[PDB]
Ligand binder design. Structure first.
Ligand SMILES: *[B]([O])([O])[C]([C][C]([C])[C])[N]C(=O)C1=[C]N([C]2[C][C][C][C][C]2)N=N1
Lengths: 202, 231, 235, 204, 232, 236, 227, 220, 239
């Protein structure tokens, strides 16, 4: 699994792979890891498929009801706090690595990291999954403040592509998402559209 | 109709006020506290010659150093007497020492007002205990006589009389009791007062006297002993 | 016999027990609330029943949160428990969603708890009314009011208690919207000195609490100096 | 294995208009035989029999609890229980203890009330119904029983032809198992009779 | 579950519910009890002596243990509940202590359960009285009597139910130290007490004696007819 | 008109087999002093309610009888205000619970039925009283188009073409009865306003009522603005 | 909390007035007619809202409990919704254990048990509705009637609601043993026409039939032709 | 066990084998693995046989109750949610991996539910021990918007791949075609295996088995 | 809450329990049920109060129920209360047979149901069961038996009894017509019919059930329409 979320002025850019493996076998080669929690709030799932789906459904329910009572677009921090609560409560029973990223009228585009234990930390960009270990040095040397919504989409596509080649648990296609104030725009990157890097050869 | 936890206009719980009126129909029990022990005496009041008078236990043993005389609804007092027995046994198990007379009276007075219909459990009282108790024992402070009624108010008294003829007996103790009176003198005074307020001619099988002295334990006078002071 | 329980409607269609609980709020002292351009000012005329009491005893103004205030009327024992109920809701909300609870939501949450005591025979309706005031950068200056029936509404200037029909005609002459908070305090202490009966009633302490931009969105009791000067302006 | 503690084997076969249910009679704790007449087949209503194999304590418990349910069911809706309905009832009972199941593999055999159509089935410990058209085996020697029935069973046998097949299958299957045998009881259920005979087996 | 206070005090310090439970005991059949020297007797008047009713299914005398037995007066349905709870305590006492229960121990338990129902929520007091009779380990015959309120006393001879006062007065003047001298004498005193509160006594009386080291023995009609002939 | 025992105090059958307590809750709906009108069109549903403002100090915005149950379901409450919010809170929870358990948005007739079932429990249990309010939900069904439902304090609910509630319920239903025997987005709104105006005889101004609509082209429940409600007001 | 004492108690004459008052509510509701006829059972009811604003297609009086069991009622509407939901859960529960459609007689007994529980339980009143269950199992038709007290009777042809005594006379002298389902509907609607006040249409009544194929609720078209 | 399903032009085609083993022994050579959830929704189930039946039987009764209430046709999402939520609550202890396929108002949907509670909405799925063999056929011949007859042939080849390459699957092939206007439950669809003919008879002539006891009882 | 309370399980001044006494009044307005004990069996002759020209026969009986293999009973009172009571009786008999693996004795069963009836008259604050039962059965300890039970929880064994409409009139007739110890099933049926007629008959207005022993097996059977019809004709010959 290789999920990634970066942010720009307008909003945020999400990305993930689509491989679901049960051992050394790919049960689902086109999994959709990016899950919408609300209109402008998404979340990348990593870890256990059953655990991340159960939590996302629960949070989506709680956030929807909360947003209907307050009669206002929910805050991205509120969605991240809900996720964090369940992730911390059942930390000994769940295996998730959720990355909440959305856009709200108050703070704009935000990216939150909710790792296994259940802690919540806001970053400008976050990477998760088993294939995120190979691109830690790449994102630290390529990320630059001031990236636009176009550069963020190329930055995420480049990092995900590099992690899919080295990780056996990551592969398939690339599902991107650019969330701004206007709305959400999904986009898939297949074979030819997936960034390629010449393999060192003698 | 009202609930069990209803206050009257004068500021009194109806149930407790009726429970105090039920103690005026019970047998009389005079208790006199001295310096050389406490003495308790109750009027057995047998209603039939076929009725065995040895089955009437108005005075019980809470512990070796504590006795108890009850009046009013005797059946309700069997639950309070057991609580006191378990309380003094529990104290010994935890602190390896005898409980004081005032401590035993305090633990029995806590259940006095523990009753109600709503917000209650299966094993909860539905009404108050219509009985009065006279606790007499000997601790570190020496002879001590306590009195506890249905309201849950326990006070200390040098001489107390509870029962049907309490008013008449209480007054006879106010002018025949002094601080230097002996334990043997107290036993006669009680017997004399009991004989006056009783309907049947006092005898060895009618009443029941008990005494608790400093160095000794709780003791219930037998027929022989009772007869000695009767003549 | 249709006014002994809250789970009984009368022939005309009224819940007498809830109407009897509103009678208790009309016997208490007058408390007013005024919302302006950047805050809310609470003015409660504390009626001192004795000279033995300390100046400040039996307060009718509490902070339910760090940005929310609460002025009460009617039974004080009931109102104190409602203030603790409002504190729990505000505290539980911050531990769930991670931020201060909106006044509109806090009012609704506490009004729903008050409406639950007006349906059964096992309990009785609260015999008190109260106002909730707060200030938020994103929101603004809010002022809600809840009565014994569990009804909560938004206001510009509210008044509860005995003299509330006479205190509402004094708050109607003010142009709260354009007004600030330091200028409102005076007017708030002036209306409480006008509605208060010096004959029927005896000594009375004037309470004053506010919450707005001035105190950076934090609800507090109006400063002694500013309260003392406002009390002189009323006289 | 817990199932191989008491041994035993039950078999049910289907005929033209009849059914047969056979079982071993040896009751024993591990390698030691206690009695040689333990009941493993119980009557659930005239033309309905249930054979239980596995833990002897669970064989008696399940037979008694099923009877308790069967009695209430027949009293409530005053009618004879149908073979297929009994299987669902038994399966439901076994599935209640899905995580602390009874160690017994039931084998139901009987004729449908009024229609008199043969019916045989088997269930696992957690109540997994399996209705077949030829035979059903349950025990510590199912492999041996599977091999016998596979090459002996015929499509439409009669009461006498069916009795010979189920007896030869059981007699030769329990002779290859050590903790199974000590007599064989066979019940042949017909439309108007219930023949029950004990075969002359090896006492080993 | 019901948690209403049924038994409560009244203006004069009375407990009406318990008083109505004692009123139900007065409408019951007369149950007489006489303690002898080596034999305890129990007599019960049979009001509804229908000829079409199995008399073994409607008896007032029961056995709690092998040394304890009892008779009652009041609501039969309640007596059954009290009788079966006492039977479980006898078996419980035998399991905790090697020896069998003493007459007083079981009487105390029966009376304590009655007092429990007169002070708890959702329940009403028992409408029966009991005459527990038996022998202890020492061989001392015992006779106790429990009532609806929960109080019990030891007796030498007592009667309960309708017309219990008339029989009690007859025992006071007739129970001496010569009337219970012999086995038959003690059994004849119980049959004589029931003859003053019954119609054509002899075929409407059911008694059971309990001798030392022996189980309950219910004397049938024939045996009771032989005793009535000696009292003529 | 006969009675015995405590039939007028608790929800228990009377001699004639009626529930006086439930009938007293229908008179509590008129206590509020307002009227609601919902008219079903051909491709839209329109909710029209009276927006009275007793005091000028009252923050008008907060005063409303229209609520957003879901993204496509809206409703109007009539009667006891406190009861109304309670019931509106119940409908929001039941609607949110339905989507989380079944995976799809709750139908307008299912929600109404579910809320009516909860109201029937108050008519059977004697420890609590029924709610003195009404609910009129309007939503757009994916198969049957626009829907207008209504459940009352007795636990009875139904589907309508045009409904009314409040003090003037018989007036608005007798006027809607003759109008239905004889509708587009504007025609569905104008018929509601006229019914509400001809029965109350007030000739409403802009800020004096509130309208809620759910069209087939835009299923999201929405509240018309001050400048949106005025356009229809100057059309007649 | 809730009351824990019985609301329905015995009177001095030995009558359970609460149940008797609930039967009076059932006797004032819309008339219902059940007819069992050889190859099937028919249930018809006066579904007239009489106002012309109510949606006739929305509400339903005749409901299907299962695939072979139909239900109809007389009395209170909201009370019937509770019993229909209970009857549907009882049929599902039974099918989850025996894996076979619950017999009509078994369902009535189970549903009558629920109605008897509201006549003895604490803080509740008896259901103010009388049901007319109909089913088809084991190649045979069934018609049962469960009143407010919890008692159930097996009928051949019956009628509840308003003018039920009048319909029982018109049904006792117009119903025949050897009757077919198709002809059974004709006499079921004719019995409802003897106390229908106004004009009977295809949207004023609701008819549900039961046969070998399973319970079915006749559509407006079918009824129209029959009328 | 080999269960599979695909989504063709206008419907869903489910398939499965009919062999049930008790270890390495064939207990049932003709068991049904395709369960009925509702009129428009069916379910193929592998994993623990007992759990697969009980879970589908419970969800089918819940969907039937829901259908009676709403009065509409059940959705595939509803069945999916119910299954996935219940499966997740037992923490994987209910070994039931099923292939859920049906056609509703939104169209034809095919899901795959795993024991732990995870689901996957794909155009074709395979479950069981012979899942990899059937997946190879789907990853080599599957095309979108296939014809009904083409989908039946492709799903038959997938079940056949598992039946002949996996030891845990055998017997016949079961198919189930669910479309917008029909529901064709073809059992069996294809019989690729047939027991060999006997080479000789082994009939047990009467009297070949000795009897120690004998008791006949005449039933009414 | 305490004002709406009716206080069902409460004593009264006379010391009686009103609720239980009011339930006994409802049993006197029910179908007459009579039981007679013979030497080779015991029968139940109850009158059918559910008569009409539009009622189906459907069930096997209307008042007589089967508790278990060797027991049966006839109720008289609230019909819905019997449905609850008789279903509980079946449970008690099944629980006992599951414990000792033997049929529950008749007196033990009747006693167990009476403990439930008496619990509703002492606590719980609920109305008592308004039904009276008649039991007939056979056990290895006492053979054929006949028990009666009322709403208070009281029970007793009889030889001949009657509960329902005319209990007092029927009881008197049985008193002067029951030859104790010399009664046969055949001669008992006459007694039932003779008493049933003089206390109210057609062959559809009544229902009879007999319980006899055949080859170490209890046999309970309801007499058929024709079977009863003949009995009714034979009583007319003596009248
Ligand atoms: B990722 O590889 O971390 C990915 C993230 C999920 C899709 C949100 N996890 C998995 O690959 C994965 C696979 N599984 C199950 C294993 C058992 C069989 C069913 C699938 N769980 N997580």
């Amino acid at each position: 699994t290789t999920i990634m979320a970066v942010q720009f002025n307008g909003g945020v850019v999400l990305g993930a792979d689509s491989r679901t493996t049960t051992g050394s076998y790919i049960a689902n080669r086109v999994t959709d890891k990016l899950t919408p929690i609300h209109d402008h709030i998404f979340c990348c799932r990593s870890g256990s498929a059953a655990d991340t789906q159960a939590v996302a459904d629960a949070v989506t329910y709680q956030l929807g009801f909360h947003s209907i009572e307050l009669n206002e677009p929910p805050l991205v921090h509120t969605a991240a706090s809900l996720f964090k609560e369940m992730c911390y409560r059942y930390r000994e029973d769940l295996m998730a690595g959720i990355i909440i990223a959305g856009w709200d009228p108050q703070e704009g585009g935000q990216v939150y990291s909710v790792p296994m234990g259940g802690m919540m930390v806001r970053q400008s960009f976050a990477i998760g999954g088993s294939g995120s270990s190979y691109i830690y040095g790449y994102v630290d040397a390529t990320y630059r403040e001031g990236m636009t919504k176009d550069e963020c989409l190329q930055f995420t596509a480049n990092a995900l592509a590099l992690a899919m080649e080295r990780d056996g648990s990551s592969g398939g296609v690339i599902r991107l998402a650019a969330i701004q104030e206007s709305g959400v725009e999904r986009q898939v990157l297949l074979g030819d559209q997936i960034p390629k890097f010449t393999i060192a050869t003698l | 109709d009202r609930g069990v936890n209803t206050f009257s206009p004068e500021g009194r719980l109806f149930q407790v006020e009726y429970a105090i009126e039920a103690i005026k129909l019970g047998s009389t029990a005079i208790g006199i506290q001295t310096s050389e022990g406490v003495c308790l005496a109750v009027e057995k009041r047998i209603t039939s010659p076929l009725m065995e008078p040895s089955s009437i236990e108005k005075i019980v043993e809470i512990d070796a150093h504590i006795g108890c005389a009850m009046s009013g609804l005797i059946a309700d007092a069997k639950t309070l007497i057991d609580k006191a027995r378990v309380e003094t046994q529990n104290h010994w198990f935890t602190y390896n020492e005898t409980m004081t007379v005032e401590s035993v009276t305090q633990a029995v007075s806590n259940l006095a007002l523990q009753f109600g219909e709503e917000d209650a459990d299966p094993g909860a009282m539905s009404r108050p205990f219509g009985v009065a108790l006279l606790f007499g024992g000997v601790d570190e402070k020496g002879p001590q006589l306590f009195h506890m009624d249905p309201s849950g108010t326990f006070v200390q008294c040098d001489a107390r009389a509870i029962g049907s003829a309490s008013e008449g007996a209480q007054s006879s103790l106010q002018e025949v009791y002094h601080k230097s009176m002996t334990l043997k003198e107290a036993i006669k005074s009680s017997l004399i007062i009991l004989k006056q307020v009783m309907e049947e001619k006092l005898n060895a099988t009618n009443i029941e006297l008990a005494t608790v002295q400093p160095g000794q334990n709780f003791h219930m006078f037998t027929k022989e002993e009772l007869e000695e002071v009767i003549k | 016999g249709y006014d002994l329980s809250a789970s009984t409607f009368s022939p005309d269609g009224r819940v007498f027990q809830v109407e009897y609980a509103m009678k208790a709020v009309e016997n208490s002292s007058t408390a007013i609330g005024i919302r302006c351009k950047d805050g809310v000012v609470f003015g409660v005329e504390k009626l001192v029943l004795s000279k033995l009491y300390e100046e400040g005893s039996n307060k009718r103004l509490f902070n339910v949160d760090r940005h929310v205030g609460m002025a009460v009327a009617g039974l004080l024992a009931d109102a104190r428990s409602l203030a603790d109920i409002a504190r729990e809701e505000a505290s539980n909300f911050r531990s769930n969603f991670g931020y201060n609870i909106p006044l509109k939501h806090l009012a609704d949450r506490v009004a729903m708890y008050v409406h639950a005591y007006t349906l059964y025979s096992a309990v009785r309706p609260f015999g008190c009314s109260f106002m909730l005031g707060s200030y938020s950068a994103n929101d603004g200056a809010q002022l809600y009011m809840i009565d014994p029936s569990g009804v909560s509404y938004g206001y510009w200037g509210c008044a509860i208690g005995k003299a509330r029909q006479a205190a509402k005609t004094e708050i109607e002459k003010l142009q709260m919207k354009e007004m600030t908070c330091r200028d409102v305090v005076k007017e708030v202490a002036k209306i409480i000195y006008i509605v208060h009966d010096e004959v029927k009633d005896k000594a009375f302490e004037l309470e004053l609490s506010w919450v707005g931009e001035l105190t950076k969105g934090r609800h507090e009791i109006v400063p002694k100096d500013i309260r003392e000067e406002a009390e002189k302006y009323a006289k | 294995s817990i199932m191989s503690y008491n041994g035993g084997a039950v078999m049910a076969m289907k005929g033209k208009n009849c059914v047969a249910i056979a079982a071993d009679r040896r009751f024993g704790i591990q390698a030691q035989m206690v009695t040689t007449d333990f009941q493993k087949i119980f009557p659930m209503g005239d033309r309905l029999y249930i054979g239980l194999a596995g833990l002897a304590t669970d064989v008696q418990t399940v037979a008694q609890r099923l009877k308790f349910r069967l009695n209430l069911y027949e009293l409530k809706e005053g009618r004879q229980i149908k073979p297929y309905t009994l299987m669902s009832m038994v399966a439901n009972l076994l599935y209640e203890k899905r995580f602390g199941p009874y160690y017994t593999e039931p084998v139901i055999a009987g004729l449908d009330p009024k229609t008199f159509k043969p019916f045989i089935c088997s269930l696992d410990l957690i109540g997994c119904p399996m209705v077949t058209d030829d035979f059903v085996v349950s025990g510590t020697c199912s492999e041996q029983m599977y091999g016998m029935c596979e090459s002996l069973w015929e499509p439409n046998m009669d009461p006498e032809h069916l009795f010979e097949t189920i007896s030869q299958a059981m007699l030769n299957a329990v002779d290859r198992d050590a903790v199974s045998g000590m007599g064989v009881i066979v019940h042949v259920i017909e439309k108007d009779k219930i023949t029950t005979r004990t075969l002359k087996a090896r006492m080993d | 579950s019901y948690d209403r206070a049924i038994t409560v005090f009244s203006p004069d310090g009375h407990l009406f519910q318990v008083e109505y439970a004692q009123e139900a005991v007065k409408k019951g059949s007369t149950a007489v009890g006489v303690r002898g020297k080596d034999i305890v007797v129990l007599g019960v008047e049979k009001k509804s002596v229908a000829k079409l009713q199995d008399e073994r299914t409607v008896r007032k005398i029961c056995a709690l243990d092998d040394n304890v037995c009892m008779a009652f007066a009041g609501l039969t349905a309640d007596a059954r509940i009290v009788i079966n709870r006492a039977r479980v305590e006898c078996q419980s006492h035998r399991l905790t202590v090697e020896d069998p229960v003493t007459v007083e121990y079981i009487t105390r338990y029966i009376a304590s359960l009655k007092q429990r129902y007169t002070q708890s929520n959702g329940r009403r007091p028992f409408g029966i009285s009991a005459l527990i009779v038996g022998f202890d380990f020492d061989g001392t015959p015992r006779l106790y009597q429990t009532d609806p309120s929960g109080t019990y006393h030891a007796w030498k001879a007592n009667a309960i139910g309708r017309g219990a006062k008339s029989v009690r007065e007859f025992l006071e003047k007739n129970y001496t130290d010569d009337a219970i001298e012999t086995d038959d004498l003690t059994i004849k005193l119980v049959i004589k007490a029931l003859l003053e509160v019954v119609q054509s006594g002899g075929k409407n009386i059911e008694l059971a004696v309990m001798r030392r080291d022996q189980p309950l023995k219910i004397l049938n009609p024939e045996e009771i007819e032989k005793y009535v002939a000696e009292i003529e | 008109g006969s009675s015995a025992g405590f039939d007028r105090h608790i929800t228990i059958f009377s001699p004639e087999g009626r529930l006086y307590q439930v009938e007293y809750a229908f008179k509590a709906i008129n206590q509020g002093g307002l009227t609601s009108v919902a008219v079903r069109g051909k491709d839209c549903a329109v909710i029209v309610t009276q927006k009275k403002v007793p005091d000028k100090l009252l923050d008008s915005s907060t005063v409303t009888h229209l609520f957003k149950i879901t993204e496509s379901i809206g409703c109007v409450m009539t009667g006891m205000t406190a009861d109304s919010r309670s019931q509106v809170q119940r409908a929001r929870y039941e609607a949110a619970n339905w989507k989380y358990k079944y995976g799809y948005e709750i139908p307008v007739d299912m929600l109404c039925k579910r809320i009516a079932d909860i109201s029937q429990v108050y008519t059977q249990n004697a420890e609590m009283r029924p709610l003195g309010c009404c609910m009129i939900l309007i939503g757009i069904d994916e198969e049957q188009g626009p829907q207008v439902y209504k459940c009352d304090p007795a636990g009875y609910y139904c589907g309508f073409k045009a409904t009314a509630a409040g003090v003037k319920q018989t007036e608005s239903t007798s006027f809607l009865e003759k109008k239905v025997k004889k509708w587009t987005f504007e025609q569905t709104v104008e018929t509601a306003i006229t019914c509400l105006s001809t029965v109350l005889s007030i000739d409403f101004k802009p800020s004096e009522i509130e309208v809620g609509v759910v069209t087939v082209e835009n299923p999201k429940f929405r509240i018309l603005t001050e400048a949106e409600i005025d356009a229809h007001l100057v059309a007649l | 909390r809730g009351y824990s004492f019985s609301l329905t108690t015995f009177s001095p004459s030995g009558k359970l007035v609460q149940i008797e008052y609930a039967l009076a509510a059932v006797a004032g509701g819309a008339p219902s007619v059940g007819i069992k006829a050889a190859n099937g059972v028919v249930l018809a009811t006066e579904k007239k809202q009489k106002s012309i604003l109510y949606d006739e297609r929305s509400v339903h009086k005749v409901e299907p409990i299962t695939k072979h069991i139909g239900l109809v009622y007389s009395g209170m509407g909201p009370d019937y919704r509770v019993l229909v939901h209970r009857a549907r859960k009882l049929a599902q529960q039974y099918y989850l254990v025996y894996q076979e459609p619950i017999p009509t007689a078994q369902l009535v007994q189970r549903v009558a048990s629920v109605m008897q529980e509201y006549t003895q339980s604490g803080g509740v009143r008896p259901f103010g509705v009388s049901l007319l269950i109909c089913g088809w199992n084991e190649g045979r038709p069934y018609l049962f009637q469960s009143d407010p007290s919890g008692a159930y009777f097996a009928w051949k042809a019956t009628a509840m609601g308003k003018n039920y005594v009048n319909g029982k006379t018109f049904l006792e002298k117009r119903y025949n043993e050897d009757l077919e389902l198709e002809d059974a509907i004709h006499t079921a609607i004719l019995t409802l026409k003897e106390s229908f006040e106004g004009q009977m249409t295809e949207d004023n009544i609701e008819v549900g039939i039961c046969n070998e194929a399973g319970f079915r609720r006749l559509t407006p078209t079918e009824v129209r032709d029959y009328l | 066990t080999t269960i599979a399903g695909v989504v063709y032009k206008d419907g869903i085609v489910l398939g499965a084998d009919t062999r049930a083993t008790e270890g390495m022994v064939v207990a049932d050579k003709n068991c049904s693995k395709i369960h009925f959830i509702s009129p428009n929704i069916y379910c193929c189930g592998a994993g623990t046989a007992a759990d697969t039946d009980m879970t589908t039987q419970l969800i089918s009764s819940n969907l039937e109750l829901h259908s009676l209430t709403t009065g509409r046709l059940p959705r595939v999402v509803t069945a999916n949610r119910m299954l996935k939520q219940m499966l997740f609550r037992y923490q994987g202890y209910i070994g039931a991996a099923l292939v859920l396929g049906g056609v509703d108002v939104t169209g034809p949907h095919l899901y795959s539910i795993y024991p732990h509670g995870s689901t996957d909405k794909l155009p074709y799925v395979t479950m069981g021990s012979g899942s990899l063999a059937a997946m190879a056929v789907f990853e080599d011949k599957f095309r979108p918007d296939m014809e009904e007859e083409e989908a039946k042939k492709l799903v038959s080849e997938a079940i056949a791949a598992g039946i002949f390459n996996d030891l845990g699957s055998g017997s016949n092939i079961d198919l189930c075609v669910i479309s917008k206007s029909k529901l064709d439950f073809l059992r069996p669809f294809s019989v690729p295996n047939k027991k060999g003919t006997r080479l000789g008879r082994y009939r047990c002539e009467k009297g070949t088995t000795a009897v120690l006891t004998e008791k006949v009882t005449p039933l009414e | 809450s305490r004002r709406y309370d009716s206080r069902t399980t409460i004593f009264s001044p006379e010391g009686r329990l009103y609720q239980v006494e009011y339930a006994m009044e409802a049993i006197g307005h029910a179908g007459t049920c009579l039981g007679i004990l013979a030497n080779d069996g015991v029968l139940l002759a109850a009158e059918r109060r559910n008569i009409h020209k539009l009622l189906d026969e459907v069930f096997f009986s209307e008042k007589i129920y089967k508790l278990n293999e060797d027991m049966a009973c006839s109720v008289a009172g609230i019909t819905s209360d019997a449905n609850v009571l008789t279903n509980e009786l079946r449970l008690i008999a099944q629980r006992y047979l599951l414990q000792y693996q033997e049929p529950i004795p008749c007196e033990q069963l009747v006693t167990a149901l009476c403990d439930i009836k008496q619990a509703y008259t002492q606590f719980g604050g609920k109305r008592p069961f308004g039904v009276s039962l008649l039991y007939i059965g056979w056990d290895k300890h006492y053979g054929f038996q006949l028990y009666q039970s009322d709403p208070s929880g009281n029970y007793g064994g009889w030889k001949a009894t009657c509960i329902g409409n005319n209990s007092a009139a029927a009881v008197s007739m049985l008193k002067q017509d029951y030859k104790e110890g010399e009664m046969t099933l055949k001669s008992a049926l006459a007694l039932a019919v003779k008493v049933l007629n003089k206390t109210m008959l057609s062959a559809e207005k009544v229902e009879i059930a007999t319980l006899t022993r055949e080859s170490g097996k209890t046999v309970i059977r309801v007499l058929k329409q024709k079977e009863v019809e003949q009995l009714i004709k034979k009583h007319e010959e003596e009248e």
